[PDB]
């Protein structure tokens with residue numbers, strides 16, 4: 157049946173993004189709880205590397221998944237992803253040491269890569285009508301956005317209420333439901349390593365990566381800054397990230413509707429500028445109510461950048477080279493993985509050497525400087 | 539009495555910038571009865587006003603603000619009467635230079651007087667905004683006045699009317715300010731070269747100078763590109779830059795109101811970014827109607843930057859140094875005059891060398907890259 161595959165891909169992507177969003181409120185609070193005041197400055201570098209682990213492992217593992225799907229079909233690598241995410245979910249709840257969380261994040265990265273590639277390939281293979289295929293991708297990405305929306309308040313809110321191991325056991329039980337649903341189941345062109353050889357696609361990917369880095373580096377160091385300065389309760393740390401998702405969804409909807417009238421490159425330029433301004437204004441708030449504005453602006457900005465830059469990548473891939481159903485997926489996935497691997501990993505050294513606001517100033521200046529480079533993309537030729 | 543001091547600066551900036559923009563309709567049509575020689579006349583006011591400014595700033599410390607303002611009145615009246623009668627190239631140069639020196643005197647003295655009378659930062663954030671609004675109104679209404687008077691009632695009429703308005707302004711100034719005695723300011727202000735070692739003053743001056751240079755480089759090179767590219771009639775050249783003036787006026791009053799509430803540094807940052815984006819999107823239009831948007835954005839953002847950076851100089855000089863406001867506003871007028879002088883003299887050479895779109899791209903990129911540096915003015919450290 158054509159449907160069930162849509163539901164299983166939905167649940168897999170939702171659970172993966174939920175795990176990514178839920179890991180952020182809990183790990184620094186877990187490190188605070190074990191010792192007992194901040195010993196965090198020694199921790200900051202240690203807390204980071206752990207977050208960039210999944211990005212680096214997914215980047216390493218992504219090229220190998222290509223021919224593996226061709227050799228042994230699509231159903232087999234999907235089953236491996238569910239098992240690996242189940243192992244990671246079980247390991248997260250029962251882990252007590254820092255070393256276990258590292259292997260948990262690495263396993264989550266491997267499972268995420270396998271599940272995403274296999275699920276998108278299976279969704280492409282099941283739908284052959286040539287028109288409902290786009291609707292399938294739209295529903296799947298909407299489910300991913302819904303998982304992003306739901307994940308952050310989940311772990312932070314239901315950590316101090318029903319204990320620590322609960323939000324990972326719930327994810328494990330949800331993953332088991334995904335396995336049962338998927339258990340009862342049943343044109344090559346221009347590879348990615350040559351697609352990154354033209355300046356237009358490189359500028360587009362760089363713009364996406366530099367827009368995403370502002371929220372990439374916010375995860376490891378924002379909760380620690382909150383407990384160090386603002387003196388907020390432990391259940392508001394994940395609640396503070398709701399604007400970054402709600403504004404992102406509102407922006408992507410409105411700007412996917414509206415960006416074609418006034419120009420895509422203008423949308424991307426304005427988006428990078430507002431990312432820079434929001435990241436500059438983030439470390440000025442002295443309470444949780446001060447993070448509502450800059451976070452919402454940053455989410456709206458990232459929505460503007462993504463919704464204005466994905467069609468540009470698609471048009472550039474179509475006009476010059478040959479394109480497939482998911483050529484844009486690989487190019488954008490390299491951007492997100494590159495950002496999540498470089499930003500959080502290098503941010504620990506910056507936070508240790510110099511203060512927190514200097515990292516935000518650096519990110520804002522980098523975004524504002526890279527913003528004028530989107531003029532290159534207006535009317536590309538060849 | 540502090541409300542009448544703002545009326546004097548409003549009238550002084552209204553008539554002084556009236557004679558600046560009234561003249562560009564009438565000069566190149568009279569001399570025809572070669573483009574470079576006509577352009578150098580337009581840069582005469584800015585070239586000499588820059589040099590007079592360093593000698594005018596510290597002079598306000600010793601004799602007060604009334605005497606320089608009366609001198610600017612007398613010089614502007616002499617300039618307009620010299621304009622109304624002379625009819626040669628050599629006699630249309632000294633008059634422009636006199637207009638420049640009078641504008642320098644009036645601007646520096648008026649800004650210093652407004653800063654001294656209005657002490658509160660929040661309350662000082664509106665008087666300078668309304669003064670810049672008066673400047674915007676003068677720049678807006680000068681050109682059509684000169685065009686219609688030259689078309690209908692000869693050439694001497696628009697300058698004679700300006701002379702009569704100048705006499706009215708002088709009578710008003712003698713009535714309100716009493717420029718008849720020399721009053722020395724008690725506080726000995728900091729020397730001017732010491733102020734240039736201040737990073738925050740330099741950043742504010744750089745922001746004002748870059749924004750005004752970006753706006754000023756557009757007027758002398760825009761009509762040439764219009765004729766070269768879209769083949770427009772002559773009558774739309776003046777009307778193309780009208781939205782810039784209107785948006786500048788609306789922005790200057792509205793954001794003089796809103797800068798204190800929303801923040802000076804955020805206002806300067808957003809204004810410089812908007813100026814950069816507008817300058818970047820200017821050279822893409824293919825018809826007259828496509829320039830309505832970018833020009834309006836440029837005017838709004840330039841009003842943003844001017845209204846934000848006017849009170850910041852006084853706030854810095856009050857926070858870190860002694861309380862005398864002549865020198866830093868002389869610096870701001872120097873930035874304005876440098877921006878207005880660099881453009882008209884070299885615009886044709888730059889466009890013939892690299893081209894109009896590259897010039898617009900460079901200006902927008904410079905503004906965007908400098909825009910991060912306004913974060914430094916959020917909270918300067920105070921003096922010991």
Ligand SMILES: COC(=O)[C@H]1[C@H]2C[C@@H]3c4[nH]c5cc(OC)ccc5c4CCN3C[C@H]2C[C@@H](OC(=O)c2cc(OC)c(OC)c(OC)c2)[C@@H]1OC
Pocket residue numbers: 173176177180297300301304308368371375397400401404455458466484485486488489492
């Ligand atoms: C985390 O997991 C992700 O990495 C996703 C998000 C990354 C980032 C983010 N992380 C947060 C973590 C938080 O916790 C505290 C709070 C807020 C945020 C935000 C707000 C801002 N934000 C954007 C999120 C978007 C997701 O990507 C897509 O939706 C997408 C869209 C497409 O087009 C429609 C694609 O092409 C078809 C595509 O494939 C290449 C992917 C992206 O990858 C799956």
Ligand SMILES: NCCc1c[nH]cn1
Pocket residue numbers: 677750753782783786840844
């Ligand atoms: N400070 C006013 C600069 C300007 C704007 N428009 C024309 N000139």
